[PDB]
Amino acid sequence: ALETVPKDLRHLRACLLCSLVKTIDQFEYDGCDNCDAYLQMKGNREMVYDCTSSSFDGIIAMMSPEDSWVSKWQRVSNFKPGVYAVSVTGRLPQGIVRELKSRGVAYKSRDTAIKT
Amino acid sequence: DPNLWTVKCKIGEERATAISLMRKFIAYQFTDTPLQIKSVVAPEHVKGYIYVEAYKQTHVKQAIEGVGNLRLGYWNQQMVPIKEMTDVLKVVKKSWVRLKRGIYKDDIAQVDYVEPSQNTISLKMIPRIDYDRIKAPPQRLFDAEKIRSLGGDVASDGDFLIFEGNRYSRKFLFKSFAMSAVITEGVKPTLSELEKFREHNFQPGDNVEVCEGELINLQGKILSVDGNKITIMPKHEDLKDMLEFPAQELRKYFKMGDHVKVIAGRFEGDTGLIVRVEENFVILFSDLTMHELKVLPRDLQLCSETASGWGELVQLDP
DNA sequence: AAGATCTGAATTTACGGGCGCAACTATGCCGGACGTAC
RNA sequence: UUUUGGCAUAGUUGC
DNA sequence: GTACGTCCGGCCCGTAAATTCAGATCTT
Ligand SMILES: [Zn+2]
């Protein structure tokens, strides 16, 4: 829905799990639109800061992941439509990753950049 | 719970300091010199220093060691008191914009065409240039004949023109600029800028009446002023007690034959005397001329200064 | 009788003044950012 | 057709 | 593409007050 689309380009942050790109206000007021139940960044700004990225390269505006080869390459075919980041710089703390793993969600990095 | 400690940082490099500290933590999280701090905060608008979350000052000092950017906070650190840790994370908040960078900083820009690409928008600007004559500046109209005559980086397409760093103009600059490089909220230009492209004014000493309520028809002199709900303190006739009135309940009423000045409108700057106060049409004679000037009650103020109403010898030619 | 506390009376740091006038020569802010030109 | 100007540090020197 | 040049950001002394000890008017 339109709630996922960013309002403006200032303070655009990419999530560290699903690469979801949103403004800081949208993260504060709605959290994550894909896996907030697994991260719970709504209602706490520090969780957003520790769970989102200030450095991202490339944006993909996905409408239809079910029939998109870009989603297959980016492994985001099973997520909802939105704005995602091609490359995301950052990493969750070990505590959040361990908590996700205990719930059966292994943390797979979205840093698909070629580092030299 | 841990506590926040202030550490002075290089100005303009606080987010980079936070990123570097996060990388430092992740690099040494398995080694024999762990960073015992909990988090690092570099707010968006707080410039000059950052905050470190820890139970001890010694932990902060041993964690920032090797960070040159924080060397000015290395010897001593200052704790955030307890009651105030909720304020560190507290955050607040064909149109017209104003450019952020370049020589056109804080200059009015009429949004000519908005590009749905969400990268840049086309803006109409007045050029602040010297037309490549002084450099080897106030706003003035774009002169295409002058820049054609002086030469240099100039390409002409009738009324349209490219010049001096790919600046695009037509008839008036018309150039694309980044949306993040302009402000869309809080410009509110004036009538002069419209040509280029309610209100409450109570003052101390003025006389105001009451138009409605149980305290109607009480005329008093203004003491204090505030923004919207003034809660005024007017010195009424035959009343030693001070009452309360908002801006909406009051009106700038003035008795006949008292000093009057005009605050705004066509008659601004003129002083004089009111002759008869009707329900809203207040008629006055100026101190300069004996012409009838009809004003609203709100466009009148009680000032006793004499009118200004100069006369120098100048040489039209020898 | 006792026991306090308890309230006026010997000992340590801290400003803060420090000659008239007069004459002469002598010395005295920069670092990043943004753009121009080549 | 009638001007005007650094200052406030240190030194040295004279009675 | 590199660098540079140049415009915007950063001893006394007397006082004098603070520190220490026996009436005193209580309580027991
Ligand atoms: Zn997430």
Short mmCIF file of C-alpha atoms (C1' of nucleotides) and ligand atoms in Angstrom, two decimals:
data_model
loop_
_atom_site.label_atom_id
_atom_site.label_comp_id
_atom_site.label_asym_id
_atom_site.label_seq_id
_atom_site.Cartn_x
_atom_site.Cartn_y
_atom_site.Cartn_z
CA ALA A 1 0.00 0.00 0.00
CA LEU A 2 0.96 3.69 -0.05
CA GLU A 3 1.99 3.46 3.63
CA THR A 4 5.16 1.65 2.52
CA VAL A 5 6.18 4.20 -0.15
CA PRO A 6 8.52 6.92 1.23
CA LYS A 7 7.09 10.42 1.53
CA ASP A 8 10.35 12.20 0.61
CA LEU A 9 14.05 11.49 0.05
CA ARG A 10 15.45 13.04 3.25
CA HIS A 11 16.81 10.51 5.78
CA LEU A 12 16.10 7.50 3.58
CA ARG A 13 17.24 4.37 5.44
CA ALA A 14 17.43 0.79 4.18
CA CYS A 15 16.50 -2.03 6.55
CA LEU A 16 19.27 -4.46 7.45
CA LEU A 17 17.08 -7.60 7.04
CA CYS A 18 14.80 -7.03 4.02
CA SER A 19 16.60 -3.98 2.50
CA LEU A 20 13.32 -2.03 2.79
CA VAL A 21 13.92 1.66 2.08
CA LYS A 22 11.81 4.12 4.05
CA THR A 23 12.10 7.48 5.73
CA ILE A 24 12.93 7.61 9.43
CA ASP A 25 9.40 8.83 10.22
CA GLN A 26 7.88 5.79 8.51
CA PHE A 27 10.19 3.46 10.43
CA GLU A 28 9.24 5.18 13.69
CA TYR A 29 5.47 5.16 13.08
CA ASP A 30 5.14 1.77 11.30
CA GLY A 31 8.40 -0.10 11.87
CA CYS A 32 9.17 -2.61 9.12
CA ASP A 33 6.49 -3.48 6.56
CA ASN A 34 7.80 -7.06 6.05
CA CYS A 35 9.29 -8.52 9.26
CA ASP A 36 8.60 -6.11 12.13
CA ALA A 37 7.19 -9.04 14.10
CA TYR A 38 10.71 -10.53 13.92
CA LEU A 39 12.55 -7.23 14.68
CA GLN A 40 10.05 -5.02 16.61
CA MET A 41 11.50 -1.62 15.68
CA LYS A 42 8.14 0.16 15.99
CA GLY A 43 7.91 2.40 19.05
CA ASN A 44 11.68 2.71 19.57
CA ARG A 45 14.08 4.86 17.55
CA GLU A 46 17.26 3.16 18.78
CA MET A 47 15.98 -0.17 17.44
CA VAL A 48 15.48 1.52 14.06
CA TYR A 49 19.02 2.91 14.16
CA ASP A 50 20.49 -0.49 15.07
CA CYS A 51 18.29 -2.33 12.51
CA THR A 52 18.42 0.09 9.52
CA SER A 53 21.25 1.33 7.31
CA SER A 54 22.36 4.89 6.58
CA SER A 55 24.35 3.73 3.50
CA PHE A 56 22.66 2.05 0.54
CA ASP A 57 23.32 1.89 -3.21
CA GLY A 58 20.64 1.39 -5.84
CA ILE A 59 16.87 1.33 -5.41
CA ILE A 60 14.45 -1.22 -6.87
CA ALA A 61 10.77 -0.27 -6.94
CA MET A 62 9.14 -3.71 -6.96
CA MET A 63 5.46 -4.04 -7.89
CA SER A 64 5.20 -7.77 -8.70
CA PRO A 65 7.84 -10.02 -7.07
CA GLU A 66 5.92 -13.17 -8.08
CA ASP A 67 6.99 -12.77 -11.75
CA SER A 68 10.24 -10.78 -11.43
CA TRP A 69 13.71 -12.11 -12.23
CA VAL A 70 15.26 -9.22 -10.28
CA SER A 71 13.52 -10.54 -7.16
CA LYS A 72 14.95 -14.00 -7.88
CA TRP A 73 18.45 -12.53 -8.13
CA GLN A 74 17.87 -10.40 -5.01
CA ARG A 75 16.10 -13.26 -3.10
CA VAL A 76 13.17 -10.88 -2.29
CA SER A 77 10.52 -12.81 -4.24
CA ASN A 78 8.64 -13.93 -1.11
CA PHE A 79 8.37 -10.40 0.35
CA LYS A 80 5.74 -7.71 -0.26
CA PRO A 81 5.98 -5.01 -2.99
CA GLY A 82 7.71 -1.78 -2.10
CA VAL A 83 11.03 0.00 -2.39
CA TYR A 84 14.13 -2.10 -1.62
CA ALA A 85 17.88 -1.39 -1.72
CA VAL A 86 20.21 -3.24 -4.09
CA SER A 87 23.23 -2.96 -1.74
CA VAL A 88 23.06 -2.21 1.99
CA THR A 89 26.02 -1.36 4.25
CA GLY A 90 25.60 -2.45 7.86
CA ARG A 91 25.07 -5.44 10.11
CA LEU A 92 22.82 -6.30 13.03
CA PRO A 93 24.34 -6.84 16.49
CA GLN A 94 24.98 -10.43 17.50
CA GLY A 95 22.11 -10.33 19.99
CA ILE A 96 19.43 -9.60 17.39
CA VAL A 97 20.88 -12.20 15.00
CA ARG A 98 20.93 -14.84 17.75
CA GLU A 99 17.37 -13.95 18.76
CA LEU A 100 16.26 -14.32 15.14
CA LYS A 101 18.09 -17.65 14.82
CA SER A 102 16.38 -19.01 17.94
CA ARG A 103 13.09 -18.15 16.18
CA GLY A 104 14.20 -19.96 13.00
CA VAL A 105 15.22 -16.89 10.95
CA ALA A 106 18.87 -17.01 9.91
CA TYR A 107 20.20 -13.54 9.09
CA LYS A 108 21.31 -13.36 5.44
CA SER A 109 23.30 -10.25 4.58
CA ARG A 110 22.07 -7.87 1.88
CA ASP A 111 25.65 -6.57 1.30
CA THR A 112 25.86 -7.96 -2.24
CA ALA A 113 28.50 -5.35 -3.17
CA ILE A 114 31.78 -6.35 -4.82
CA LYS A 115 34.38 -5.16 -2.30
CA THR A 116 37.39 -4.73 -4.60
CA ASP B 1 20.45 0.64 33.33
CA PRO B 2 23.50 2.22 31.64
CA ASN B 3 24.03 5.97 31.31
CA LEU B 4 24.86 8.33 28.46
CA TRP B 5 28.18 10.21 28.52
CA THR B 6 29.03 13.21 26.35
CA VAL B 7 32.19 12.97 24.22
CA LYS B 8 33.34 15.96 22.19
CA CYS B 9 33.87 15.10 18.52
CA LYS B 10 35.06 16.75 15.33
CA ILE B 11 32.27 18.96 14.03
CA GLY B 12 30.56 17.68 10.89
CA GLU B 13 31.98 14.15 11.37
CA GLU B 14 29.72 12.66 14.06
CA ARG B 15 27.89 10.12 11.88
CA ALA B 16 31.25 8.99 10.49
CA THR B 17 32.48 8.66 14.08
CA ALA B 18 29.46 6.48 14.91
CA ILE B 19 30.08 4.30 11.85
CA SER B 20 33.78 3.97 12.71
CA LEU B 21 32.98 3.04 16.32
CA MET B 22 30.46 0.43 15.14
CA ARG B 23 33.08 -1.07 12.82
CA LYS B 24 35.58 -1.01 15.68
CA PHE B 25 33.13 -2.83 17.96
CA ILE B 26 32.36 -5.50 15.35
CA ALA B 27 36.06 -5.98 14.54
CA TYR B 28 37.08 -6.54 18.19
CA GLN B 29 33.92 -8.18 19.57
CA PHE B 30 35.71 -11.58 19.64
CA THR B 31 39.18 -10.36 20.73
CA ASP B 32 40.69 -9.94 24.21
CA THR B 33 40.03 -6.15 24.26
CA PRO B 34 36.23 -5.96 24.02
CA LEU B 35 34.31 -2.70 23.85
CA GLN B 36 32.18 -2.84 27.00
CA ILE B 37 30.05 0.15 25.92
CA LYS B 38 26.46 -0.51 24.76
CA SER B 39 25.62 2.04 22.04
CA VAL B 40 26.73 5.26 20.34
CA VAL B 41 24.34 8.12 19.51
CA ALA B 42 25.11 10.82 16.93
CA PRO B 43 21.88 12.85 16.57
CA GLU B 44 20.86 14.43 13.29
CA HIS B 45 20.93 18.10 14.39
CA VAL B 46 23.28 17.89 17.41
CA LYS B 47 26.63 19.04 15.98
CA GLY B 48 29.99 18.93 17.78
CA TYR B 49 29.69 15.91 20.08
CA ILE B 50 28.28 12.39 20.43
CA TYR B 51 26.98 10.22 23.29
CA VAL B 52 28.24 6.84 24.57
CA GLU B 53 26.03 4.44 26.55
CA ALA B 54 27.93 2.75 29.39
CA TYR B 55 27.83 2.01 33.11
CA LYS B 56 31.25 3.64 33.72
CA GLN B 57 33.37 6.53 32.49
CA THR B 58 36.42 4.26 32.38
CA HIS B 59 34.60 2.03 29.89
CA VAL B 60 33.95 5.08 27.69
CA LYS B 61 37.60 6.17 27.86
CA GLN B 62 38.90 2.67 27.07
CA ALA B 63 36.36 2.36 24.23
CA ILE B 64 37.17 5.67 22.48
CA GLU B 65 40.94 5.02 22.67
CA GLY B 66 42.51 5.19 19.22
CA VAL B 67 39.72 7.42 17.85
CA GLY B 68 41.39 10.70 16.93
CA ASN B 69 38.09 12.47 16.21
CA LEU B 70 37.15 12.18 19.92
CA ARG B 71 40.58 13.18 21.29
CA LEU B 72 39.18 16.47 22.63
CA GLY B 73 36.81 14.44 24.84
CA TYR B 74 39.39 11.78 25.73
CA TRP B 75 40.73 13.11 29.04
CA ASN B 76 37.33 13.97 30.59
CA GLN B 77 33.73 12.96 29.91
CA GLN B 78 30.45 14.41 31.20
CA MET B 79 27.48 12.25 32.17
CA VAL B 80 23.94 12.92 30.97
CA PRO B 81 21.82 13.21 34.18
CA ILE B 82 19.13 10.61 34.70
CA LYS B 83 15.88 12.56 34.26
CA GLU B 84 16.89 13.91 30.82
CA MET B 85 17.85 10.80 28.81
CA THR B 86 14.47 10.85 27.03
CA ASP B 87 15.33 14.20 25.39
CA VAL B 88 18.41 12.95 23.52
CA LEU B 89 16.21 10.87 21.19
CA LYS B 90 13.44 13.49 21.16
CA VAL B 91 12.85 14.69 17.59
CA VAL B 92 10.66 17.52 16.28
CA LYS B 93 9.66 18.98 12.92
CA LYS B 94 3.81 25.55 -8.68
CA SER B 95 5.08 26.11 -5.14
CA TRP B 96 8.11 28.03 -3.82
CA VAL B 97 11.41 26.70 -2.51
CA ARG B 98 14.80 28.12 -1.51
CA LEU B 99 18.16 26.69 -2.56
CA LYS B 100 20.52 25.41 0.12
CA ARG B 101 23.97 25.57 -1.54
CA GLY B 102 25.66 27.67 -4.20
CA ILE B 103 25.55 31.43 -4.69
CA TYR B 104 21.72 31.20 -4.82
CA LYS B 105 21.49 30.27 -1.13
CA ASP B 106 18.17 31.15 0.53
CA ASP B 107 16.82 32.73 -2.68
CA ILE B 108 13.19 32.36 -3.73
CA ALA B 109 12.66 29.74 -6.46
CA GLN B 110 9.34 29.22 -8.26
CA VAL B 111 8.86 25.48 -8.82
CA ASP B 112 8.33 25.56 -12.58
CA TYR B 113 8.18 21.84 -13.44
CA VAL B 114 8.24 19.00 -10.91
CA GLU B 115 9.94 15.89 -12.28
CA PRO B 116 8.24 12.63 -11.11
CA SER B 117 11.73 10.99 -11.18
CA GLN B 118 12.17 12.24 -7.56
CA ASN B 119 15.75 13.42 -8.20
CA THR B 120 15.56 17.07 -9.34
CA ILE B 121 12.92 19.74 -9.97
CA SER B 122 12.98 22.64 -12.41
CA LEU B 123 13.22 26.01 -10.64
CA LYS B 124 12.70 29.58 -11.81
CA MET B 125 15.38 31.90 -10.38
CA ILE B 126 16.61 35.49 -10.68
CA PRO B 127 20.34 35.42 -11.55
CA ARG B 128 22.88 36.74 -9.02
CA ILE B 129 25.69 37.15 -11.56
CA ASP B 130 28.11 39.80 -12.80
CA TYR B 131 27.80 38.59 -16.44
CA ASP B 132 31.50 37.60 -16.50
CA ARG B 133 32.71 41.19 -16.08
CA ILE B 134 34.13 41.46 -12.52
CA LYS B 135 35.17 37.88 -11.75
CA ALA B 136 38.22 36.68 -13.69
CA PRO B 137 25.98 40.11 -6.26
CA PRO B 138 22.34 41.27 -5.82
CA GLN B 139 19.37 39.93 -7.73
CA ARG B 140 18.80 41.61 -11.10
CA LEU B 141 16.90 40.71 -14.24
CA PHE B 142 18.60 38.40 -16.72
CA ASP B 143 20.17 40.43 -19.55
CA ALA B 144 20.83 38.16 -22.53
CA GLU B 145 22.17 41.00 -24.70
CA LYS B 146 24.89 41.78 -22.15
CA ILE B 147 26.10 38.18 -21.84
CA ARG B 148 25.99 37.84 -25.63
CA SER B 149 28.11 40.99 -26.01
CA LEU B 150 30.67 40.10 -23.32
CA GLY B 151 31.11 36.60 -24.75
CA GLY B 152 32.63 33.73 -22.81
CA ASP B 153 30.67 30.58 -21.97
CA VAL B 154 27.44 31.59 -23.73
CA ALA B 155 25.05 29.70 -26.02
CA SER B 156 21.97 31.51 -27.34
CA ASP B 157 18.67 30.02 -28.56
CA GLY B 158 16.60 33.18 -28.87
CA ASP B 159 15.08 33.70 -25.45
CA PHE B 160 16.63 30.45 -24.15
CA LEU B 161 20.27 30.48 -23.07
CA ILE B 162 23.00 28.30 -21.53
CA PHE B 163 25.89 29.97 -19.76
CA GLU B 164 28.55 29.94 -17.04
CA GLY B 165 28.50 26.39 -15.71
CA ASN B 166 25.50 25.03 -17.62
CA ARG B 167 23.14 27.58 -16.05
CA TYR B 168 19.92 27.48 -18.09
CA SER B 169 17.71 30.55 -18.55
CA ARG B 170 14.72 31.60 -20.64
CA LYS B 171 13.32 35.11 -21.21
CA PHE B 172 14.89 34.35 -15.87
CA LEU B 173 16.94 31.31 -14.90
CA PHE B 174 15.14 27.97 -15.45
CA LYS B 175 17.42 25.27 -14.00
CA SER B 176 17.08 21.81 -12.49
CA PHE B 177 18.13 21.43 -8.84
CA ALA B 178 18.10 18.55 -6.37
CA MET B 179 14.99 18.28 -4.22
CA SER B 180 17.16 17.51 -1.18
CA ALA B 181 19.05 20.74 -2.03
CA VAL B 182 15.88 22.86 -1.54
CA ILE B 183 13.30 23.39 1.22
CA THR B 184 9.59 22.94 0.40
CA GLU B 185 8.21 23.74 3.89
CA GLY B 186 8.27 27.22 5.42
CA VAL B 187 9.06 29.63 2.58
CA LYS B 188 5.88 31.79 2.51
CA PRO B 189 7.03 34.57 0.16
CA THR B 190 5.70 38.11 0.02
CA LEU B 191 3.77 40.23 -2.48
CA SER B 192 7.04 41.56 -3.92
CA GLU B 193 8.11 38.00 -4.71
CA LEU B 194 4.67 37.37 -6.26
CA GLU B 195 5.43 40.33 -8.55
CA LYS B 196 8.93 38.97 -9.26
CA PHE B 197 7.37 35.60 -10.19
CA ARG B 198 -5.51 36.58 9.97
CA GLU B 199 -3.05 38.81 11.83
CA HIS B 200 -3.06 40.37 15.30
CA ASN B 201 -1.01 43.50 16.07
CA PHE B 202 -1.65 44.84 19.58
CA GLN B 203 0.90 47.08 21.31
CA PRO B 204 1.24 48.52 24.84
CA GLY B 205 -0.55 51.81 25.43
CA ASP B 206 -3.18 51.38 22.72
CA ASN B 207 -6.87 51.65 23.62
CA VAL B 208 -9.09 48.61 22.96
CA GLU B 209 -12.75 47.89 23.74
CA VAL B 210 -14.72 44.68 24.25
CA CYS B 211 -17.09 43.69 21.43
CA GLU B 212 -18.68 40.58 22.99
CA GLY B 213 -19.16 38.74 26.27
CA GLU B 214 -20.27 39.74 29.75
CA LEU B 215 -17.47 42.38 29.88
CA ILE B 216 -18.70 44.24 26.79
CA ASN B 217 -18.06 47.96 26.17
CA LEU B 218 -15.11 48.26 28.57
CA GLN B 219 -12.36 50.44 27.08
CA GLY B 220 -8.86 50.04 28.52
CA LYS B 221 -5.19 50.58 27.71
CA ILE B 222 -3.08 47.62 26.60
CA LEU B 223 -0.30 46.46 28.95
CA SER B 224 1.07 43.16 27.57
CA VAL B 225 1.02 41.29 24.25
CA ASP B 226 1.34 37.63 23.21
CA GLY B 227 0.78 35.59 20.06
CA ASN B 228 -2.77 34.24 19.63
CA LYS B 229 -4.64 34.07 22.98
CA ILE B 230 -3.17 37.19 24.52
CA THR B 231 -4.90 37.09 27.93
CA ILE B 232 -4.51 40.86 27.90
CA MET B 233 -4.20 43.09 31.00
CA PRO B 234 -6.20 46.23 30.08
CA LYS B 235 -6.49 49.27 32.35
CA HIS B 236 -10.19 50.06 32.05
CA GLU B 237 -11.97 53.28 33.01
CA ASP B 238 -12.99 53.37 36.69
CA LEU B 239 -11.65 49.89 37.45
CA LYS B 240 -8.55 49.16 39.53
CA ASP B 241 -8.69 45.39 38.87
CA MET B 242 -7.07 43.93 35.76
CA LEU B 243 -9.26 41.60 33.64
CA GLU B 244 -8.43 39.02 30.94
CA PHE B 245 -9.37 39.13 27.23
CA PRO B 246 -8.06 37.21 24.17
CA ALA B 247 -7.22 38.80 20.83
CA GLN B 248 -10.48 37.75 19.17
CA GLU B 249 -12.72 39.38 21.78
CA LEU B 250 -10.96 42.76 21.55
CA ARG B 251 -11.00 45.43 18.85
CA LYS B 252 -8.84 48.51 18.28
CA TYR B 253 -11.42 51.12 19.28
CA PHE B 254 -10.35 54.76 19.57
CA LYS B 255 -12.20 57.81 20.88
CA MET B 256 -12.83 60.81 18.67
CA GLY B 257 -10.01 63.34 18.36
CA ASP B 258 -6.95 61.34 19.39
CA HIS B 259 -3.63 60.62 17.71
CA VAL B 260 -3.96 57.88 15.08
CA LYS B 261 -1.42 56.14 12.85
CA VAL B 262 -1.97 53.54 10.12
CA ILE B 263 -0.07 50.26 10.52
CA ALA B 264 -0.59 48.78 7.04
CA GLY B 265 -2.50 49.20 3.79
CA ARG B 266 -2.71 52.02 1.29
CA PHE B 267 -2.77 54.66 4.06
CA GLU B 268 0.27 53.36 5.98
CA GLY B 269 2.82 55.89 7.20
CA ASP B 270 0.23 58.69 7.58
CA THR B 271 -0.68 60.16 10.98
CA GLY B 272 -3.65 62.28 11.99
CA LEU B 273 -6.96 62.56 13.86
CA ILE B 274 -10.21 60.57 13.63
CA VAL B 275 -13.40 62.66 13.42
CA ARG B 276 -16.29 60.17 13.69
CA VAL B 277 -16.10 56.45 14.50
CA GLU B 278 -18.84 54.48 12.75
CA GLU B 279 -19.35 50.74 13.29
CA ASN B 280 -16.18 49.95 11.29
CA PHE B 281 -15.46 52.88 8.91
CA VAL B 282 -13.23 55.23 10.93
CA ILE B 283 -12.72 58.54 9.09
CA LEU B 284 -9.66 60.72 9.75
CA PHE B 285 -7.79 63.78 8.54
CA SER B 286 -4.05 63.56 7.97
CA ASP B 287 -1.60 65.94 9.61
CA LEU B 288 -0.17 66.74 6.16
CA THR B 289 -3.33 67.06 4.04
CA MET B 290 -6.99 67.64 4.89
CA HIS B 291 -8.21 64.67 2.82
CA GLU B 292 -10.65 62.10 4.21
CA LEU B 293 -8.98 58.74 4.95
CA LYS B 294 -11.33 55.87 5.85
CA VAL B 295 -9.76 52.95 7.73
CA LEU B 296 -10.73 49.77 9.52
CA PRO B 297 -10.60 49.85 13.34
CA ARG B 298 -7.82 47.24 13.32
CA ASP B 299 -5.59 49.42 11.08
CA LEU B 300 -5.35 52.12 13.80
CA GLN B 301 -2.80 52.52 16.59
CA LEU B 302 -2.29 55.08 19.37
CA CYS B 303 1.10 56.74 18.86
CA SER B 304 1.76 60.34 19.93
CA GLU B 305 4.86 60.99 17.79
CA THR B 306 4.77 63.87 15.33
CA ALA B 307 4.40 63.12 11.63
CA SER B 308 7.57 63.00 9.54
CA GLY B 309 6.12 64.38 6.31
CA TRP B 310 14.33 66.33 2.79
CA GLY B 311 14.53 69.40 0.56
CA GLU B 312 18.20 69.19 -0.43
CA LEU B 313 19.99 71.00 -3.25
CA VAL B 314 21.07 68.59 -6.02
CA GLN B 315 22.59 69.24 -9.44
CA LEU B 316 20.42 68.01 -12.31
CA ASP B 317 23.23 69.21 -14.57
CA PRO B 318 25.94 71.93 -14.39
"C1'" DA C 1 24.81 12.89 87.08
"C1'" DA C 2 25.46 12.39 82.28
"C1'" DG C 3 25.34 13.31 77.78
"C1'" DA C 4 24.80 15.27 74.59
"C1'" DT C 5 24.19 18.65 70.98
"C1'" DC C 6 25.74 22.97 70.37
"C1'" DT C 7 27.33 28.04 69.75
"C1'" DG C 8 31.06 31.70 70.45
"C1'" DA C 9 36.32 31.50 69.84
"C1'" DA C 10 41.70 29.89 67.82
"C1'" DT C 11 43.76 28.51 63.19
"C1'" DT C 12 44.29 27.90 57.23
"C1'" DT C 13 43.60 29.77 51.73
"C1'" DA C 14 42.20 33.82 48.58
"C1'" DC C 15 42.04 38.64 46.32
"C1'" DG C 16 44.76 42.34 45.63
"C1'" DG C 17 47.19 46.74 45.65
"C1'" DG C 18 52.48 47.44 43.80
"C1'" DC C 19 56.05 56.03 41.56
"C1'" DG C 20 55.78 60.53 38.37
"C1'" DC C 21 55.71 61.87 33.66
"C1'" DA C 22 58.18 61.96 28.98
"C1'" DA C 23 60.76 60.05 24.52
"C1'" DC C 24 62.49 56.56 21.13
"C1'" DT C 25 62.16 51.89 18.07
"C1'" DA C 26 59.73 47.21 17.56
"C1'" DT C 27 55.92 43.53 16.28
"C1'" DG C 28 51.18 42.08 15.03
"C1'" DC C 29 45.55 34.74 12.31
"C1'" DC C 30 44.32 30.20 9.39
"C1'" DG C 31 42.10 25.70 7.36
"C1'" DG C 32 38.68 23.13 4.69
"C1'" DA C 33 35.46 23.72 0.41
"C1'" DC C 34 33.93 25.03 -3.57
"C1'" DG C 35 34.76 26.34 -7.82
"C1'" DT C 36 38.02 27.95 -12.24
"C1'" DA C 37 41.10 27.40 -15.01
"C1'" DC C 38 44.22 24.62 -17.21
"C1'" U D 1 36.97 74.65 -2.87
"C1'" U D 2 41.61 73.75 3.49
"C1'" U D 3 42.88 68.49 5.70
"C1'" U D 4 43.28 64.83 9.98
"C1'" G D 5 43.43 58.84 12.35
"C1'" G D 6 45.30 52.47 13.96
"C1'" C D 7 45.64 50.82 18.39
"C1'" A D 8 47.69 47.98 22.92
"C1'" U D 9 51.73 44.47 24.23
"C1'" A D 10 56.93 44.19 24.95
"C1'" G D 11 61.55 46.43 25.25
"C1'" U D 12 65.06 50.37 25.76
"C1'" U D 13 66.28 55.13 27.33
"C1'" G D 14 66.02 60.36 30.06
"C1'" C D 15 65.21 63.16 34.72
"C1'" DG E 1 42.17 14.52 -13.27
"C1'" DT E 2 45.19 17.40 -9.90
"C1'" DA E 3 46.33 20.89 -7.50
"C1'" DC E 4 46.07 25.58 -5.91
"C1'" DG E 5 43.80 30.00 -4.52
"C1'" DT E 6 40.97 32.03 -1.97
"C1'" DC E 7 36.09 32.59 0.69
"C1'" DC E 8 33.42 30.71 4.87
"C1'" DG E 9 33.75 27.97 9.78
"C1'" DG E 10 35.92 27.84 14.21
"C1'" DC E 11 55.81 39.52 48.73
"C1'" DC E 12 52.34 41.58 51.96
"C1'" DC E 13 47.82 42.22 54.89
"C1'" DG E 14 43.79 42.80 56.18
"C1'" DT E 15 40.03 40.94 55.71
"C1'" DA E 16 37.30 37.18 55.80
"C1'" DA E 17 35.08 33.34 55.82
"C1'" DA E 18 35.46 28.38 57.25
"C1'" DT E 19 36.85 25.07 61.15
"C1'" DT E 20 36.82 23.67 66.33
"C1'" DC E 21 35.35 23.89 72.21
"C1'" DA E 22 33.24 25.06 76.78
"C1'" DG E 23 28.49 27.78 78.87
"C1'" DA E 24 23.88 26.62 78.96
"C1'" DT E 25 19.59 25.52 79.22
"C1'" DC E 26 17.62 22.00 78.14
"C1'" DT E 27 16.59 16.96 78.25
"C1'" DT E 28 16.82 12.79 80.67
ZN ZN F 1 14.03 -5.45 9.37
#
